[PDB]
Design a protein around this ligand. Structure first.
Ligand SMILES: Nc1ncnc2c1ncn2[C@@H]1O[C@H](CO)[C@@H](OP(=O)(O)OC[C@@H]2O[C@H](n3cnc4c(N)ncnc43)[C@H]3OP(=O)(O)O[C@H]32)[C@H]1O
Ligand SMILES: Nc1ncnc2c1ncn2[C@@H]1O[C@H](CO)[C@@H](OP(=O)(O)OC[C@@H]2O[C@H](n3cnc4c(N)ncnc43)[C@H]3OP(=O)(O)O[C@H]32)[C@H]1O
Ligand SMILES: Nc1ncnc2c1ncn2[C@@H]1O[C@H](CO)[C@H]2OP(=O)(O)O[C@H]21
Ligand SMILES: Nc1ncnc2c1ncn2[C@@H]1O[C@H](CO)[C@H]2OP(=O)(O)O[C@H]21
Lengths: 432, 433
């Protein structure tokens, strides 16, 4: 899939010029038509500041005024139907309006918007144009794109191209080349940050601190996160540290995460005060790092949801998950650890033995007086620590036990074991 | 170390205004004075485009023009003279003159310049100001900064802060706030790129095929790198995959890396054609990704050179190197693998036995079943694979062998073994890319 993303300011102020790109030429006020003609994207995203808004009735008449004039402009130079328009929250004191709030809301808002548009299946070829952007909006859009594509690159091949045309200079320009300023194959970067303290999801920008403590207390999201924060951190660590059984057992509820993000999003939006006479927008809540982490966490869950196999969790199924999820020395460590359990299962199968509901330590034949569950042993053994895992072999009539044993040998954490592993992985994620 | 980096365009066109930052207030045409007062950096770096220069009699006069104009502007505003000015190669056809070449040259140039500025010892607090920047030079500067800080973060704590001012509207603007638009604890990110083909170090932008072929053919770098490539990729893979013995055995020659980067940088600068009459700069060579990889590779070697020691490698030394280079599950696996060899040495010591020049497979007691060296066993066992490593125990009189064995037990790759590990690690680095 080919995706095109452009950063736009006040598109109406741009002058007609001609652009050169990929053995093609084009005349008009923006690069988008020639970019679309050479690149041939399957989808186009335009990121705009809402600070080009003029009619201050309230929030919906602002996003409307901007979307009207943008859709006007896309018709004017024929940018086609396959378009999404992200109206990001800008800030500043302009000729027709005043916009106050955290600068960083534009990052979290664009991050959130892109997380709903970027395909979570198949390979991604991403094309980014920085020609026309506000400095800060273009930079936060670039960062938001790279953060999400890094997560996408966990499961899929991801290539990223950035463009910037020659500088338009009004009195001397004849034509502007579209220069490739970046070409990069995107490195797989799993989410590597804990969920923060319940202060850093929504933050008061210009809200009295007594009013904040009130609304924070009313958010069901923060109370639900209280329970699940450690379980969600355990899942993040599963991808980062190569713990395939924990990846399955802690796989997050995509529906629940959607609902957490939506409530934080509509709470932020609801705290935007518009003064039609003063022509002033004040975003009294700011998004915190915690909103970003939830958006990245939901995106990673969507990217990897295909790997959530039906129970029970056989060695064969854990190999299949591991082979998709892990790379380099992490994959090879995980395969060696599963192989040790598999070789034991084969030995058992050959003797017509099928242990059910047996601690992994008893399955492998361990000596007594080492029942302490250490970070070292959880992290060094792909989370398959001998004191926290229960093995079951579903009895069968073996013909080729070396082929069969992997399918009939199932692993899970004991209820006590899972809590110990959660504490260890959560802690290891925080120390980082 | 507190480092302030600012991305600037045409500083002479900026209007006087007022800035708010960290409770302080400032009148003037630039953020820089108030940024310095509040942040109190140990050093300031200014990144701006060549395309400000108005003197085409030489390439070096063009740079001294831009430098002198910046120096004068710093006196005009309250700003300190403790600064590095990176005059990046910009592109565009302007009234005062013309500049042609690869747009991406600015990235490779700034990356190279920053690699020689950013300290390679101690923690780093980096502050980046994009308020005054061109978009493309800001993006390429931001990228180069993050690429190097990611490598620095392997050995040291690195914090990154980014700033941008409220937008400037000509007569409406009274006071522009300077906004923090990023606060990042930089993740350790070792080089994970192989060295590319010999097409991708220097490329012709505007140069006859034969003259390029002559320049390419003159480069000592490309000849040497042909033979050295695999050993350098083995070293890159040692940091990425958690192979502490290979890190020590393949530690690159910093002097030779410096020689390669300087030669490529001198050839690039020597190919800049400055036509004095018609006010044109043409950069006839373009940097390739290979130049970037070498700059990142030398920066990583400088960052980690403190861990290198002389040839006998003890298990104790491998533990301390590992505790500095590696984290998470990679670190815990390396410690378990070293521990297995240590526990065996402790058993040997308690028996009063001190094997020398013994294959690790013989030291550990292995079945004659598998002598083949697999990617699986090299990468899963921290590169301490039983068929490629040799152990030597230095005879001593044990009293507490559990605490003593690690210092007296040494590991080496066999000459054959090392070449097998180099192949697997090089291939694994290329395959992971
Ligand atoms: N069809 C179009 N119509 C109108 N604008 C277009 C169009 N196509 C592309 N653009 C670009 O889109 C941004 C619209 O504002 C501009 O991009 P950017 O070049 O990044 O503008 C930034 C300013 O260029 C200025 N500076 C003018 N001289 C030079 C110069 N010779 N060396 C480096 N910078 C220069 C800088 O001074 P500072 O730092 O105050 O602000 C920058 C335009 O060049
Ligand atoms: N002391 C200073 N003197 C002169 N400039 C200063 C100073 N301090 C900071 N700056 C900033 O430096 C850049 C160049 O002057 C400016 O920021 P940049 O992000 O480069 O803004 C460029 C243009 O602002 C325009 N646009 C003005 N309204 C709005 C608006 N309300 N919605 C979105 N964009 C707006 C954009 O339209 P477009 O795409 O044609 O080009 C941009 C200035 O805000
Ligand atoms: N606490 C522990 N100490 C030593 N080895 C362990 C421990 N927990 C798990 N393992 C080893 O991890 C592998 C996957 O379960 C398995 O292979 P093993 O070496 O037979 O013992 C296990
Ligand atoms: N080819 C191999 N097959 C199985 N285990 C290996 C191999 N090569 C090395 N190891 C194991 O890696 C550890 C550090 O050298 C050491 O602990 P072990 O389990 O005694 O066997 C070694």
């Amino acid at each position: 899939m080919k995706l095109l993303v452009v950063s736009w300011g006040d598109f109406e102020r741009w002058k007609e010029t001609k652009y050169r790109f990929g053995g093609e030429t084009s005349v008009g006020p923006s690069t988008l038509p020639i970019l679309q003609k050479v690149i041939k994207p399957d989808w186009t995203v335009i990121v705009l500041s809402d600070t080009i808004g003029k009619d201050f009735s309230s929030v919906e008449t602002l996003r409307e005024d901007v979307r009207n004039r943008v859709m006007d402009f896309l018709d004017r130079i024929g940018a086609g139907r396959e378009v999404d328009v992200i109206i990001a929250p800008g800030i500043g004191e302009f000729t027709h309006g005043s916009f106050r709030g955290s600068a960083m809301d534009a990052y979290y808002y664009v991050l959130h918007a892109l997380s709903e548009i970027i395909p979570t299946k198949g390979d991604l070829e991403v094309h980014f144009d920085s020609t026309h952007g506000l400095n800060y909006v273009t930079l936060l859009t670039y960062r938001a794109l790279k953060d999400l594509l890094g997560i996408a690159a966990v499961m899929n091949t991801v290539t990223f191209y950035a463009y910037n045309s020659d500088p338009f200079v009004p009195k001397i320009t004849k034509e502007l080349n579209i220069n490739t300023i970046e070409t990069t194959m995107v490195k797989p970067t799993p989410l590597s940050e804990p969920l923060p303290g319940f202060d850093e999801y929504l933050c008061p920008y210009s809200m009295e601190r007594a009013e904040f403590v009130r609304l924070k207390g009313s958010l069901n999201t923060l109370k639900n996160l209280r329970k699940e924060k450690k379980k969600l951190e355990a899942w993040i660590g599963s991808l980062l540290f190569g713990l395939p059984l924990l990846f399955l057992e802690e796989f997050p509820d995509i529906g629940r995460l959607e609902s957490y993000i939506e409530e934080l999003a509509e709470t932020w939006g609801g705290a935007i005060a518009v003064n039609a006479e003063e022509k002033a927008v004040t975003r009294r809540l700011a998004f915190g790092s915690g909103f970003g982490t939830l958006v990245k966490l939901l995106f990673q869950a969507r990217i990897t949801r295909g790997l959530l196999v039906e129970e029970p969790y056989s060695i064969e199924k854990l190999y299949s998950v591991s082979d998709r999820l892990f790379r380099g020395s992490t994959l090879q460590r995980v395969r060696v650890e599963l192989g040790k359990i598999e070789d034991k299962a084969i030995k058992y199968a050959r003797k017509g033995a099928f242990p059910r509901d047996i601690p992994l330590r008893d399955f492998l034949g361990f000596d007594a007086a080492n029942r302490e569950v250490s970070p070292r042993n959880v992290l060094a053994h792909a989370g398959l620590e001998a004191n926290v895992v229960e093995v079951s072999m579903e009895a069968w009539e073996p013909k080729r036990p070396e082929e069969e044993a992997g399918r009939h040998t199932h692993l899970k954490y004991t209820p006590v074991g899972l809590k110990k592993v959660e504490d260890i992985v959560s802690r290891a994620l925080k120390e980082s």
